[PDB]
Design an enzyme around this catalytic site. Structure first.
Site, PDB file in Angstrom:
ATOM      1  N   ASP A  26      26.391  84.414 128.398  1.00 13.91           N
ATOM      2  CA  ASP A  26      26.829  85.797 128.350  1.00 13.91           C
ATOM      3  C   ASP A  26      25.845  86.634 127.537  1.00 13.91           C
ATOM      4  O   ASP A  26      24.916  86.121 126.911  1.00 13.91           O
ATOM      5  CB  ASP A  26      28.236  85.895 127.757  1.00 13.91           C
TER       6      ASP A  26
ATOM      7  N   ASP B   9      35.066  81.481 135.547  1.00 11.87           N
ATOM      8  CA  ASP B   9      34.982  80.784 134.273  1.00 11.87           C
ATOM      9  C   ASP B   9      36.260  81.034 133.488  1.00 11.87           C
ATOM     10  O   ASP B   9      36.889  82.084 133.630  1.00 11.87           O
ATOM     11  CB  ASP B   9      33.780  81.243 133.444  1.00 11.87           C
TER      12      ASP B   9
ATOM     13  N   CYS C 133      43.545  61.854 141.700  1.00 15.60           N
ATOM     14  CA  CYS C 133      42.477  62.432 140.891  1.00 15.60           C
ATOM     15  C   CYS C 133      41.390  61.392 140.648  1.00 15.60           C
ATOM     16  O   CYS C 133      41.701  60.258 140.267  1.00 15.60           O
ATOM     17  CB  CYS C 133      43.014  62.934 139.558  1.00 15.60           C
TER      18      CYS C 133
ATOM     19  N   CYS D 197      39.043  61.321 138.303  1.00 12.02           N
ATOM     20  CA  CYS D 197      38.481  61.319 136.964  1.00 12.02           C
ATOM     21  C   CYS D 197      38.680  59.962 136.290  1.00 12.02           C
ATOM     22  O   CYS D 197      39.546  59.179 136.691  1.00 12.02           O
ATOM     23  CB  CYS D 197      39.118  62.420 136.121  1.00 12.02           C
TER      24      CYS D 197
ATOM     25  N   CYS E 163      42.469  59.161 135.118  1.00 14.45           N
ATOM     26  CA  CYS E 163      43.469  58.789 136.112  1.00 14.45           C
ATOM     27  C   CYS E 163      43.137  57.475 136.807  1.00 14.45           C
ATOM     28  O   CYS E 163      44.045  56.795 137.298  1.00 14.45           O
ATOM     29  CB  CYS E 163      43.624  59.904 137.147  1.00 14.45           C
TER      30      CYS E 163
ATOM     31  N   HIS F 110      40.159  65.040 132.347  1.00 13.53           N
ATOM     32  CA  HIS F 110      40.999  65.196 133.531  1.00 13.53           C
ATOM     33  C   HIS F 110      41.170  66.662 133.909  1.00 13.53           C
ATOM     34  O   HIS F 110      41.093  67.013 135.092  1.00 13.53           O
ATOM     35  CB  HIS F 110      42.365  64.551 133.305  1.00 13.53           C
TER      36      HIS F 110
HETATM   37 ZN    ZN Z   1      42.494  62.911 136.290  1.00 11.19          ZN
END
Ligand code: ZN
Ligand code: QEI
Ligand code: ZN
Lengths: 380, 383
Positions: B93, B260, B298, B300, B303, B329
């Site tokens: 920014d 964002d 998911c 990630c 998970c 996650h």
């Molecule tokens: Zn996850």
């Protein structure tokens, strides 16, 4: 646990413990250290970041103080703590207390022993203790014991005498309960050597506990500040001289590299790895060499001299932090109270510590531990 | 001027767009949620973890880096890319948004008396040049959307003048991409003026500013729709400060490409894990014996490895790893949602995807938020 010693030079036991684990296909090299965890997790490190470290021990240490309050959950889970914490591949030795945050003393009786976790105090009799181990299902677990005869206060001889008999009564009770449980028969109970600072009770504790079919021995009450005193070092050798050579010797509260080598000379095999955790918690990184508050083995990365230092923590280190980040970045993370600092420091401090134990076994094969011991103590 | 964005697919029904950004540190598929990288490191997430989640662009807080460690050390550390060892793209920014605004720039007073620091448009471009980010933001005069009166118009015209001053000071368009920020508040006329004035400048991208500041949701999505209706179709549209799942799905339908928000990184500290039905308050005791993952769909690390019960145990301990697991996650949820949005656009089934997302999130369509029903209906998506 089939222990096999390669050789014993100057009292140091070099070997390996085979036939370990649920599959029986695991080995633990001695002398070595156990992976230190808190609430079933290596501090600051998820299972993902833990894979980024080289030379992680195959056996990890759990503490009842961090897990006893989760008894009902693991009981309903049924599948054991290793699978519960997403680490089913590792070996697990469950000790009674946590070496860094053990809790207040004075809660040991002949009927119950207390541990302390995040939720508070958990009082457990021998029955409750074996019920929790039946839920955790660890590979090894320290037997319930009385280790409070060893304290800074002037302990009585009768108190040291009591800790021997009380721990033996706990031992024989746990063996009767284990024999009545199908699940707990798979676990390996570890006898605990007590006796305080009284030589006679220390010798009696070692002889009487060795008369039980335990799979190993925990040497309790030798922790020292700033290190193991010479009185307890001689006390330790007298105990290990009474123990069988065919079983592992574990010690608690001894993790600084100088006392580790002193205890290996006394015949101690396995150690806790909480010292690199303490180094991390003060924003420090281990820098001591082993090739061929804060100690001199480490550097303080909160110091202003590392603002523009773009070198790694240790030149030549193969850890994630030293191969990808700089001291300036670590110093910056510490000034802004960012949790990545604790992650990056713990990765290096574990890798440096685990590599230090590789040098102990490498030096024992080459019969050069005296040189390595001289190199460690010269940095103090 | 070379376009930094190519449209791959558009929704024939709504304004949804699927594309990719050509940036100096790799290409970024759009729509894309951009995590605030300065908070992810504060959350204990390494570069390797964030890259493993598929994130190819993240944010950096210019003002934060201006306090620690300063632009001088970042420049000596081979830019912000080399300082944090981030191999992919970075968006910083202008660092201007305790602060007074004059025509010279934004003024920061020193605590307990002391000399001032003046962040001018030229100073802001110079500071962002040292960080070496792939996308740099214009210095704008920001007034909150709750405020009304003459300051709104005063800040809009000043934002245009500062845009021209940033463009003149930005001497390396080949290495960094300067974005304009549409201001004009919630006033349709002032925002239309800012849209007409700022789109005459040769900047590679445009951002929609002055929104998501406590205003009514009706005034929110209509100011988004007015922005996307007048912004160049062949340039990316960046909506700042939007990260709620429903807001992302709706604003993609209105034609936004980049987003964002510090939202996914913060609720992870509160114990909340994002799921297609909303969020799981994993600190609550109802998950103490829930031996299933947060989301079995998911990808990630959390998970694929851990259960809700285990994360509940860590949240009731001193383990800082409990925050690491949820931050991983929650970022993965944002990237998975936006990539699912993008696949629906490429497969010409975005409305059906929106209907399914809204049904899973709220249930019966009469329980959907009224603002989202109108916003989606304005682009032909009925529930
Ligand atoms: Zn996850
Ligand atoms: N430079 C800049 N950064 C930004 N981040 C988020 C917004 C937009 N949301 C903010 C604008 C006004 C509202 O009170 C809200 O707090 C923005 C901007 O308008 N300009
Ligand atoms: Zn290292």
């Amino acid at each position: 646990p089939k222990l096999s010693l390669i050789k014993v030079v100057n009292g140091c036991r070099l070997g390996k413990i085979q036939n370990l684990g649920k599959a029986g296909d695991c080995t633990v090299d001695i002398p070595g250290c156990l992976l230190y965890t808190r609430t079933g997790s290596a501090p600051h490190l998820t299972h993902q970041t833990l894979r980024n470290i080289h030379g992680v021990p195959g056996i990890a240490q759990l503490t009842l103080s961090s897990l006893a309050e989760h008894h009902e959950v693991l009981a309903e889970y049924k599948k054991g703590v290793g699978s519960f914490i997403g680490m089913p591949e590792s070996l697990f030795y469950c000790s009674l207390h946590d070496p860094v945050t053990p809790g207040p003393a004075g809660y040991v009786t002949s009927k119950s022993v207390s541990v302390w976790g995040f939720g508070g105090r958990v009082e457990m009799t021998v029955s409750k203790f074996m019920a929790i181990q039946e839920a955790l299902q660890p590979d090894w677990f320290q037997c319930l014991s009385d280790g409070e005869a060893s304290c800074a206060e002037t302990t009585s001889i009768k108190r040291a005498r009591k800790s021997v008999d009380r721990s033996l009564l706990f031992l024989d009770s746990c063996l009767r309960l284990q024999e009545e449980s199908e699940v707990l028969q798979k676990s390996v109970i570890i006898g605990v050597i007590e006796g305080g600072d009284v030589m006679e009770e220390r010798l009696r504790s070692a002889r009487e506990t060795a008369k039980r079919p335990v799979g190993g021995f925990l040497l309790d009450g030798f922790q020292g500040d700033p290190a193991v005193t010479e009185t307890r070092l001689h006390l330790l050798s007298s105990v290990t001289a009474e123990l069988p050579e065919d079983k592992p010797r574990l010690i608690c509260g001894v993790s600084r590299p100088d006392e580790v080598l002193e205890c290996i000379e006394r015949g101690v095999d396995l150690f806790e790895s909480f010292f690199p955790y303490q180094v991390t918690e003060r924003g420090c990184a281990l820098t001591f060499t082993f090739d061929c508050e804060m100690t001199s083995f480490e550097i303080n990365l909160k110091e202003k001299k590392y603002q523009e230092d773009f070198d790694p923590l240790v030149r030549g280190c193969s850890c994630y932090c030293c191969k990808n980040h700089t001291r300036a970045y670590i110093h910056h993370l510490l000034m802004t109270n960012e949790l990545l600092a604790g992650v990056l420091l713990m990765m290096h401090n574990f890798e440096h510590y685990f590599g230090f134990f590789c040098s102990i076994r490498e030096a024992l094969k080459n019969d050069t531990l005296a040189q390595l011991k001289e190199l460690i103590c010269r940095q103090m | 001027a070379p376009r930094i964005m190519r449209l791959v697919a558009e929704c024939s029904r709504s304004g949804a767009r699927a594309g990719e950004l050509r940036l100096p540190h790799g290409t970024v598929a759009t729509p894309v949620f951009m995590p605030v990288g300065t908070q992810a490191t504060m959350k204990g997430i390494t570069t390797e973890q964030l890259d493993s989640l598929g994130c190819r662009i993240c944010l950096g807080n210019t003002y934060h880096l201006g306090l620690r460690p300063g632009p001088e050390l970042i420049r000596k550390a081979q830019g912000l890319h080399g300082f944090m060892n981030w191999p992919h793209n970075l968006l910083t920014d202008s660092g201007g948004f305790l602060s007074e605004v004059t025509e010279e720039g934004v003024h920061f007073r020193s605590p307990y008396d002391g000399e001032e620091t003046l962040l001018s448009p030229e100073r802001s471009v110079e500071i962002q040049n040292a960080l070496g980010s792939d996308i740099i933001m214009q210095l704008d005069h920001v007034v909150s959307s709750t405020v009304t009166g003459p300051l709104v118009e005063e800040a809009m015209h000043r934002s245009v003048r500062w845009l021209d001053r940033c463009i003149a000071a930005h001497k390396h368009p080949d290495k960094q991409n300067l974005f304009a920020i549409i201001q004009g508040g919630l006033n349709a006329d002032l925002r239309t003026t800012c849209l007409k004035e700022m789109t005459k400048r040769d900047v590679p991208g445009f951002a929609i500013g002055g929104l998501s500041g406590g205003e009514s949701k009706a005034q929110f999505w209509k100011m988004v729709a007015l922005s996307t209706s007048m912004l160049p179709k062949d340039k990316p549209r960046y909506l700042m400060g939007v990260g709620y799942a429903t807001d992302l799905v709706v604003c993609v339908a209105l034609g936004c490409d980049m987003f964002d928000c510090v939202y996914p990184t913060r609720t992870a500290r509160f114990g909340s894990a994002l799921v297609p039905t909303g969020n799981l308050q994993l600190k609550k005791k109802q998950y103490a014996k829930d031996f299933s993952p947060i989301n079995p769909e998911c990808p990630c690390p959390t998970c694929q490895t851990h259960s809700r019960a285990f994360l509940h145990a860590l949240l009731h301990s001193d383990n800082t790893t409990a925050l690491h697991h949820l931050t991983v996650h929650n970022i993965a949820y944002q990237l998975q949602l936006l990539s699912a949005v993008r696949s629906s656009i490429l497969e010409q089934r975005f409305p059906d995807f929106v209907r399914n997302f809204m049904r899973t999130m709220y249930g019966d369509h009469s329980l959907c938020p009224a603002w989202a029903v109108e916003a989606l209906a304005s682009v032909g998506i009925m529930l």
